[PDB]
């Protein structure tokens, strides 16, 4: 339903009746060095006088009024000065270097600090801040060391973990490999085998609890 | 209720947070270089728009830069 | 010699100099040569640590790779 | 004594003028190749192809999943499907899996997104 | 039915202990899990129920408790001995100086009091123990 | 990436060698081989700085006349060849007509003559052949990475049938990661074999070269004697025969502790840690095993810079006015260097190796450390401030009275304490005798005493403050999250009232100024007492007497060493005493302003080359686009100029008022 | 680009998104609070690391957190106006 306007490049639009009355000054953006633009677009029922981001002052047109400027920051903040002088018609557009134009700020038309439907959580984690998995836990994994990454799944996994690890005295010691018994990989079932390795894990824990029971 | 969709995981939300597909010109920007034009009557512009028929500067690491996103990480929905 | 040490021009401690230099040109460039094949080696080694492990090897490099018996006796014992 | 000095006239400037403004230009010349610093500069292609490397090779072919090591996942997904039919509230319509699911997937479109650049 | 917070950290409570159960058993595999690692080494439980086991005695954990005393006691005797005796009540400096040798039953008696302490601790280790 | 700034060369410089956090290290294989190699490579460089010192002691250096005359005469260290210098007279370094030459501060002459280098053809033969041993060292990495690379391949190509398979993937780094056996060696092989190796290599070669006359090597080579020979004024050589020999033994018999080669024999590490007090901890961790290594390494640094200080262990050493001050001060600087390290690993283990348990369960001794680390800091931060206020009030009472010209009206508490060790100590050594000792007891005064407590108010804070950010590197009232973020990073923000410097790297960098100071006032007490034995006992006792008749008062040869009326041999040491002062001066830049200013400052200066007319078509700025230094980047870069300054600043006072 | 996360301890009063200078977050409808809102953070490719949002946050410890990663600083998050990576 939001229409993205023209916004023609600001090489290209070299003088417009929109653009407000203002002094000029060295703070504008590179253009020998830079392409990437953010234009802000608003309408103004009076001629009021309003600072630039970029050094001077400025006068907005009664009417339709556009700016332009180097970084989404300087618009934000032109915007909430708008804002503070009551103008929410304003837009603002990322224009790429081959004139694309993003609509950026009023995403989806509605202002970010008011409630609207159809918005979903974005990087949002179901727990207390310290509910984060411990950095040390989660080493040469996926988050090697970014502990606040982890999914809410592994957070619970990894505190588990935790909690089985602390009681020493029943923990199940991996048995060690035989080495000699390696064949090549060119050299049966899944479940088969998965059935086979269970028999060779309670053979080793009964000669385990034969091996402790013989002194003790 | 963003039209944008996300390249790596569809799941996911787009990496831009936009709810607005952007907005293609009639005819893309061709690259420029501003420069001097003699007026060819003795007079002289500054800084005159001219084409350039390529990269400005042929480092790869210009070159390998699109403007699609922070690291060129939006889908083709971002051009 | 123009002592600046207290100590020194009390004491009159010297600095002795020799007639002739220690080593000859060949000992100067026997050593030279054992430094160079250090500076190779070096090289090689900075190049290894630099591109670290390659674990495609076993894809195309020749053989089947070997673990030596007693590095096997090693992983059976354990840490 | 001092006819070594000979020695010195020729290393003492190779190896102080020379030899550190040949490292510099190389280092210059270096700073500007795709992977410059491959090991600590994150989105380079000799980076990801070393990680892809990684994941080919059998052993560590999934020895990046965080919940690795579970020998019988289907053993443990019953015994907790087990659980949670025993502690179930009345009346509640969370299932195991389900749940598993939910809490494995999250929304972090933002996390190394510089893994583009690679691929 | 809505699945409330309380809901939500029930099921958390019970997949926390149940899969901490299974971390345990012998169906998980963690690097912690080796040998040298968290767990007992196979078939030598150092500490049970809180209590040390015979095998915190090593070799010596087939060694009844009163012979244990009696080696712990006689060892203490005789390292006692013998350091007092070097030291003090024979010293061995000034032969030494001279020239003579040292009295080699002193030396090799005067290791045996640390060894007679652990020889202790190991026998009420044992008697702790139950042997 | 091409997108980068010039913050990109600072990023990588500062973790070049955290190999842990390298890209692709996909596990700790990769992690622990890199480890191996990067240490055969150090012994590489080790191994080549030993033959380059030998070398130039053979070539440009008087080794042969200075063991002719070793009192009087003084070492060369190497030759000068430096154009800048003046070519239409001679230097104050050569002899008029001779190529100019540095005295040598650091002992390796003493050194090799008491190991028993009597020519420089034996000189030569070291520097080959210790020039060879860097060949093997390399040689060995590159043996290594292969026989690594080889398992990696085996393991692909061939798999155990069963699914536990994937168990071998711990074991691929057992040699590099196991301890057992790695003790073991090392222990007994690397310092028991090696004492009695040396052990025989004295009464081969050493013993001779100082006996004048020949007498074939036997039990008469291993003596008891204590005390230094009057003739050499050093330790009796026969005795350091006998001392790595005993320890060779000893440590040769301890090595045999632990199971190594098989499971018969020895006991394991676990099992004794499980069983002792401490409860157990990450003996994997590679921060950890750093840490222990660094602090093993601090303590015995610091006890050889003592030790040969007190006990003369080189023939003629003592004489060598210089080279006794340069020794200490040098293995303190160190071993105050090592100290800090192992803290600051210890920190980085807690913050990314240590796997804490759940806050109620108390089982390990770091969660126990962690639960009370409230009352840690609060009674060594108790202890700090009560040392700093009665010794600086003490100093300054002393300071005022003297200053108003009563001596009489100074506090001079005597050190009881330190004389009852002391006279017990020579209680202990007269007995020896009747059955010398120099330096090793010193006549300790009031001074002594107030110098002693200002010691160790230094070693209370370095150690408050590197225990403060290892306890709350984890989690902490300010930032209870500090474990997800990295070990040292900028800041928090300037909400929650601020959070400067928050990071425990934070702490390391203002603990490193400590360390600095607490080493300076060690060396000061050093010098000063080295200098001025008897005026250091009697005006000791104010800070007046430190700042004029110490620093004042021997300042006069080094700033005089250059200036309108001609240059001396001390020239050198005058101008690294003034661009010692300037790196520390710049050093204060970095750690005062901070980056907003810079970073605008820098972007005006951008603007600038930006509407330069010639530059502007040639450099865009988009490709390392200039920027000012992060703020971790400039406290790091504050902190080397500062410490560069500092320390570099003292070798030449201590030369010039030595020499 | 530097990690904004928001927590469950979010109480939805919104300050964080007027504190917001590059307009990263939005509020966004929820039912785990009173207010029926929390925060987001969509946009964090914007974020510069003011933590202005950390600042203005009530929750005894904040529900937003931000994470700097100095490694993978972008144009957007560095503020760079002389210079362009696009
Ligand atoms: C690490 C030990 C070391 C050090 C600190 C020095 C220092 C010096 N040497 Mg050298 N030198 C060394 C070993 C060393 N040397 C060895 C082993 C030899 C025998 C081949 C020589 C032979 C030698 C000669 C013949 C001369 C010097 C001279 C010099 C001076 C200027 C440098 C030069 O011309 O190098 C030239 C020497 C080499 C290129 C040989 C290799 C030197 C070492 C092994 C390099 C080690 C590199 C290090 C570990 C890492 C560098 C990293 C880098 C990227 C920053 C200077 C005092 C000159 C002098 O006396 O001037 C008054 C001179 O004429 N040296
Ligand atoms: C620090 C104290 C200490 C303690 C508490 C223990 C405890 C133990 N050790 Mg021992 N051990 C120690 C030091 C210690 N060890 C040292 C220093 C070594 C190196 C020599 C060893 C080497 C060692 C091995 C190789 C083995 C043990 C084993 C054992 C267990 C049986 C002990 C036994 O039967 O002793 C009673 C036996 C004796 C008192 C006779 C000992 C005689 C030899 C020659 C050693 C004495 C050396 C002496 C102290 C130093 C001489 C110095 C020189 C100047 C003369 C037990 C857990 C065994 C075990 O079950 O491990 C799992 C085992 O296999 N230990
Ligand atoms: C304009 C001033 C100036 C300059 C340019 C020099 C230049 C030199 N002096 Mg010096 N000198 C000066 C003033 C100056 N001096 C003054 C005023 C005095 C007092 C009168 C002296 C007294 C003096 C003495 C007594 C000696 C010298 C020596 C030297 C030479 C050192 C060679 C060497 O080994 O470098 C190697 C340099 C280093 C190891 C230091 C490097 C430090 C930087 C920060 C880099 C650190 C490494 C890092 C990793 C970066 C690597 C980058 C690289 C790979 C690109 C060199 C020709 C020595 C000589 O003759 O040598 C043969 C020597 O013995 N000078
Ligand atoms: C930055 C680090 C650093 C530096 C620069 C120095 C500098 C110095 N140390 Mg050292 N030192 C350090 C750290 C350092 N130390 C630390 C951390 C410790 C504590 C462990 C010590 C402990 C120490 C002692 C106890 C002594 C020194 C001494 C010295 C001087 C060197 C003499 C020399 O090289 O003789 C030249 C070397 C030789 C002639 C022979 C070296 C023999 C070794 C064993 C060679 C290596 C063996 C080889 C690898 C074997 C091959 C394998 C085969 C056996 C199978 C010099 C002042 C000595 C001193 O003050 O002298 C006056 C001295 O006595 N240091
Ligand atoms: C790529 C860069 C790099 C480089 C150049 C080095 C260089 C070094 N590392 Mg390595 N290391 C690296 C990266 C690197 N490391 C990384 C990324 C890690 C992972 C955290 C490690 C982890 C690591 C550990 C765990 C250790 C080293 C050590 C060493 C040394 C190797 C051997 C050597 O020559 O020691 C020469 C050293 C000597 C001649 C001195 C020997 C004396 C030792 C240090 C003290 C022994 C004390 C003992 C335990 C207790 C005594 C008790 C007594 C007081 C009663 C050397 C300083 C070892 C070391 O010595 O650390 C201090 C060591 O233990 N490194
Ligand atoms: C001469 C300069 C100077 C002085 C007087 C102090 C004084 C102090 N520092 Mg130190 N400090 C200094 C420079 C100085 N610092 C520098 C340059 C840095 C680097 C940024 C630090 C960094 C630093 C840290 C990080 C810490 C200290 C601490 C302390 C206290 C140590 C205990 C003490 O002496 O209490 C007695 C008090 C005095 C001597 C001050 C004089 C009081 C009247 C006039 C008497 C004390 C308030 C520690 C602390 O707070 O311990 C409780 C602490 O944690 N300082
Ligand atoms: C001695 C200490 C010291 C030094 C050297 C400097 C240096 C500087 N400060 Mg200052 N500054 C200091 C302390 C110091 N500061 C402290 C303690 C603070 C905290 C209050 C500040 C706070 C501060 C601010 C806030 C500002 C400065 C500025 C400056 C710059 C002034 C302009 C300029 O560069 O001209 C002179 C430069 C020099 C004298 C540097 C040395 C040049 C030598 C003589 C020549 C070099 C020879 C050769 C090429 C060297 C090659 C070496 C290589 C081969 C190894 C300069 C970099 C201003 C600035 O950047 O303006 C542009 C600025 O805004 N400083
Ligand atoms: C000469 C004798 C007297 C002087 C002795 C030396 C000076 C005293 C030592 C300095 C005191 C601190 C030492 C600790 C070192 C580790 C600290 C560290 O990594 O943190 C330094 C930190 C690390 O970086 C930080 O890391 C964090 C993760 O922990 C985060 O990622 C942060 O964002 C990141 O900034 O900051 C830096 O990046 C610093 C910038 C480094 C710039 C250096 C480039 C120029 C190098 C030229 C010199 C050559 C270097 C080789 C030397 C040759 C020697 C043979
Ligand atoms: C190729 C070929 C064939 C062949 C052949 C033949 C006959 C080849 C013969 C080759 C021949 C005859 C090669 C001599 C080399 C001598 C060297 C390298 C000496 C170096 C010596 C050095 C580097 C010494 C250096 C110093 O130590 C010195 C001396 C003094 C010291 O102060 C230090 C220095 C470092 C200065 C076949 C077998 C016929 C058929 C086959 O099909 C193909
Ligand atoms: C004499 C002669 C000759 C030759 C000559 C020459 C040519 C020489 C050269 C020389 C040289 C030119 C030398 C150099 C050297 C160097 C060195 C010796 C160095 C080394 C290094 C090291 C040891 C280390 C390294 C490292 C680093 C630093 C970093 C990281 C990595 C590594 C670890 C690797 C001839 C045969 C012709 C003839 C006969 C005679
Ligand atoms: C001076 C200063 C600066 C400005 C200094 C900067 C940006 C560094 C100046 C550059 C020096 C002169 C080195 C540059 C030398 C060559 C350009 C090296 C190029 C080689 C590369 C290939 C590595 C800061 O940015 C800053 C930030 C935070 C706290 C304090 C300060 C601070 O004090
Ligand atoms: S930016 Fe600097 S002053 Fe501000 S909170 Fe961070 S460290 Fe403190």
């Not at chain 6, 300054?645 to 030449?652: A, N, V």
Request: net charge neutral; charged share 20%.
């Amino acid at each position: 339903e939001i229409v993205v306007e023209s916004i023609p490049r600001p090489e290209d639009l070299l003088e417009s009746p929109k653009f407000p009355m203002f002094e000029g000054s060295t703070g504008g953006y590179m253009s020998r060095s830079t392409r990437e633009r953010h234009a802000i677009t608003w309408t103004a029922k009076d001629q009021n006088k309003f600072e630039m981001p970029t050094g001077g002052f400025a006068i907005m047109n009664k009417g339709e009024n556009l700016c332009y400027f180097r970084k989404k920051e300087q618009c934000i903040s032109l915007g909430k000065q708008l804002r503070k002088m009551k103008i929410e018609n304003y837009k603002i557009y990322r224009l790429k270097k081959d004139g694309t134009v993003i609509f950026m700020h009023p995403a989806d038309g509605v202002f970010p600090e008011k409630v609207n439907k159809g918005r979903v959580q974005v990087n949002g984690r179901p727990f207390t801040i310290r509910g984060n998995p411990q950095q040390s836990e989660l080493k040469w994994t996926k988050y090697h060391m970014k502990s606040y990454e982890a999914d809410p799944l592994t957070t619970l996994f990894i505190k588990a973990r935790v909690m089985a690890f602390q009681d020493i005295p029943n923990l199940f010691a991996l048995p060690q490999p035989n080495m000699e018994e390696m064949v090549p990989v060119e050299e049966y079932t899944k479940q088969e085998y998965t059935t086979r390795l269970m028999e060779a894990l309670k053979r080793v824990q009964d000669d385990r609890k034969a091996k402790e029971a013989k002194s003790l | 209720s963003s039209k944008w969709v996300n390249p790596e995981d569809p799941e996911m939300s787009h990496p831009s947070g936009l709810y607005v597909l952007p907005l293609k010109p009639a005819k893309p920007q061709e690259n420029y270089i501003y420069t001097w034009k003699k007026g060819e009557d003795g007079s002289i512009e500054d800084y005159v728009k001219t084409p350039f028929k390529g990269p400005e500067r042929a480092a790869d690491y210009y070159t390998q830069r699109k403007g699609n996103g922070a690291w060129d990480h939006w889908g083709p929905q971002g051009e | 010699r123009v002592p600046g040490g207290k100590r020194t021009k009390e004491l009159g401690l010297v600095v002795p100099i020799p007639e002739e230099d220690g080593l000859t040109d060949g000992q100067i460039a026997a050593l030279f040569v054992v430094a160079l094949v250090v500076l190779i080696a070096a090289v090689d080694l900075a190049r290894s640590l630099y591109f670290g492990l390659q674990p495609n090897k076993f894809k195309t490099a020749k053989g089947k790779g070997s673990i030596t018996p007693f590095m096997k006796r090693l992983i059976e014992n354990g840490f | 004594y001092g006819d070594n000095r000979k020695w010195s006239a020729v290393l003492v400037p190779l190896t102080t003028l020379v030899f550190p403004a040949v490292a510099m230009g190389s280092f210059v010349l270096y700073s500007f190749q795709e992977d410059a610093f491959w090991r600590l500069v994150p989105g380079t292609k000799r980076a990801a192809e070393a990680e892809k490397a990684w994941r080919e090779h059998p052993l560590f072919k999934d020895s990046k999943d965080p919940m690795f090591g579970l020998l019988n996942p289907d053993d443990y997904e019953k015994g907790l499907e087990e659980a949670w039919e025993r502690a179930k509230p009345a009346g509640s319509t969370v299932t195991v899996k389900d749940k598993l699911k939910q809490l494995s997937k999250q929304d972090s479109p933002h996390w190394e997104s510089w893994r583009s650049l690679s691929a | 039915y809505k699945e409330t917070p309380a809901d939500e950290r029930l099921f958390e409570q019970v997949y926390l202990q149940y899969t901490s159960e299974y971390m345990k058993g012998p169906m998980y595999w963690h690097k912690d899990k080796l040998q040298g690692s968290l767990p007992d080494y196979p078939g030598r439980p150092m500490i049970r129920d809180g209590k040390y086991t015979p095998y915190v005695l090593g070799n010596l954990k087939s060694f009844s408790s009163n012979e244990l005393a009696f080696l712990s006691m006689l060892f203490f005797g005789v390292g006692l001995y013998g350091n007092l005796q070097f030291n003090y009540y024979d010293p061995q400096w000034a032969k030494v100086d001279a020239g003579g040798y040292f009295n080699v039953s002193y030396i090799v008696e005067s290791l045996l009091l640390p060894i007679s302490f652990f020889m202790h601790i190991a026998c009420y280790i044992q008697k702790q123990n139950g042997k | 990436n091409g997108r980068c700034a010039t913050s990109r060369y600072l990023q990588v410089m500062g973790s070049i060698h955290d190999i842990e956090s390298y890209f692709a290290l996909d596990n700790t294989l990769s992690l622990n081989l890199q480890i191996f190699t990067a240490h055969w490579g150090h012994l590489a460089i080790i191994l080549m700085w030993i033959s380059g010192n030998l070398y130039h002691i053979a070539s440009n250096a008087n080794y042969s006349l200075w063991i002719k005359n070793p009192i009087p005469s003084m070492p060369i260290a190497h030759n000068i060849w430096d154009p800048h210098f003046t070519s239409s007279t001679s230097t104050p370094y050569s002899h008029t007509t001779t190529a100019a030459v540095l005295i040598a501060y650091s002992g390796i002459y003493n050194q090799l003559y008491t190991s028993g280098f009597s020519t420089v053809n034996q000189i030569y033969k070291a520097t080959f052949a210790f020039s060879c041993l860097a060949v093997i060292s390399i040689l060995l990495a590159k043996i290594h990475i292969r026989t690594h690379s080889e398992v990696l391949h085996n393991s692909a190509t061939h798999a155990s049938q069963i699914p536990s398979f994937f168990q071998l993937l711990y074991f691929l780094d057992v040699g590099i990661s196991s301890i057992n056996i790695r003790l073991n060696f090392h222990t007994g092989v690397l310092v028991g074999f090696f004492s009695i190796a040396y052990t025989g290599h004295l009464l081969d070669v050493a013993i001779p070269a100082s006996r004048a006359p020949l007498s074939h090597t036997s039990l008469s080579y291993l003596t008891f004697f204590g005390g230094l020979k009057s003739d050499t004024a050093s330790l009796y050589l026969t005795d350091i025969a006998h001392h790595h020999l005993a320890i060779g033994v000893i440590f040769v018999y301890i090595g045999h502790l632990y199971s190594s080669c098989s499971t018969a024999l020895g006991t394991y590490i676990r099992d004794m840690l499980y069983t002792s007090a401490i409860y157990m901890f990450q003996i994997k961790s590679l921060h950890l095993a750093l840490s222990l290594a660094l602090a093993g390494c601090a303590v015995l640094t610091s006890a050889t810079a003592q030790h040969i200080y007190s006990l003369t262990p080189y023939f003629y050493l003592s004489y060598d006015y210089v080279t006794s001050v340069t020794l200490y001060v040098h293995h303190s600087y160190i071993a105050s260097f090592l100290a800090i390290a192992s803290h600051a690993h210890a920190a980085i283990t807690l913050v990314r190796d240590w796997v804490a348990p759940l806050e109620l369960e108390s089982s390990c001794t770091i969660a126990r450390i962690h639960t009370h680390k409230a009352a840690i800091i609060s009674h060594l931060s108790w202890v700090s401030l009560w040392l700093g206020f009665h010794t600086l009030a003490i100093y300054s009472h002393n300071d005022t009275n003297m200053a108003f010209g009563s001596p009489s009206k100074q506090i001079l508490i005597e050190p009881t304490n330190a004389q009852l060790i002391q006279e017990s100590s020579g209680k202990a050594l007269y007995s020896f005798a009747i059955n010398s000792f120099g330096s090793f007891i010193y006549p300790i005064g009031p001074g002594d005493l107030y110098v002693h407590h200002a010691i160790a108010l230094g070693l209370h804070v370095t150690v408050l403050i590197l225990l403060k950010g290892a306890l709350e590197a984890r989690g902490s009232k300010l930032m209870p999250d500090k474990m997800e973020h990295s070990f040292g990073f900028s800041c928090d923000g300037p909400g929650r009232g601020g959070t400067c410097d928050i990071s425990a790297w934070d702490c390391f960098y203002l603990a490193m100024f400590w360390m600095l100071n607490t080493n300076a006032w060690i060396d000061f007490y050093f010098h000063y007492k080295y200098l001025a034995p008897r005026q250091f006992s009697e005006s000791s006792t104010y800070l007046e007497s430190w700042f004029r008749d110490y620093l004042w008062f021997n300042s006069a040869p080094l700033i005089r060493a250059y200036s309108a009326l001609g240059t001396n041999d001390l020239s050198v040491q005058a101008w690294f005493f003034l661009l010692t002062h300037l790196a520390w001066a710049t050093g204060f830049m970095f750690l005062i302003s901070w980056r907003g200013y810079w970073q605008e400052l820098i972007d005006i200066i951008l603007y600038m080359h930006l509407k330069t007319p010639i530059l502007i078509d040639l450099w865009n700025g988009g490709v390392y686009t200039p920027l000012a230094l992060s703020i971790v980047q400039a406290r790091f870069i504050g902190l080397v100029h500062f410490t560069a300054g500092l320390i570099l600043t003292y070798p030449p006072f201590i030369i010039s008022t030595t020499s | 680009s530097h990690a904004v996360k928001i927590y469950d301890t979010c109480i939805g009063c919104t300050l964080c998104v007027r504190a917001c200078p590059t307009d990263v977050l939005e509020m966004v409808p929820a039912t785990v609070n009173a207010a029926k809102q929390v925060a987001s953070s969509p946009r964090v490719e914007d974020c510069v690391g003011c933590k202005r949002c950390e600042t203005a946050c009530p929750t005894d410890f904040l529900s937003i957190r931000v994470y700097l990663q100095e490694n993978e600083e972008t144009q957007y998050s560095l503020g760079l106006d002389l210079a362009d990576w696009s």
